[PDB]
Amino acid sequence: PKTVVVRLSPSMNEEQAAEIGREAGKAALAAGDRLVFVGPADQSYAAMKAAMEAGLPEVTMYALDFSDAESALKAAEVAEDEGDEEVAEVAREIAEEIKAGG
């Protein structure tokens, strides 16, 4: 099955993360795809809860610590080393936005 990667932003609220999860979970079930989440700690919980409640049995997450620019940069470096090509891509995009702002 194909992997669908979901990018979660620290600016997302509780409602947005849940909506994105539910829809991604419903969309993954229709295509028979796998769901990988990349983002902060809190938003990725709500998103993953909503995806499993939508009927997905498993969810892989790369949880990143965004409380500090240096901590987010090392966290992105780890996620580039692990994770498939789409996960590495999301992590490079985060390293660029963090290296400039956040």
**Residue 100: CA count within 13 A, CB half-sphere:** 5
Model resolution, angstroms: 2.6
Residue 64 structural domain:
3-100
Q: Let me know if 85 is exposed, middle or buried by CB neighbors in 10 A (0-12, 13-18, 19+).
A: exposed
Residue whose entry in the numeric block shows the structure tokens 């789409």: 86
**Residue 75: CA count within 13 A, CB half-sphere:** 20
Count structural domains, the chain. Answer: 1
Question: Obtained via which technique?
Answer: X-ray
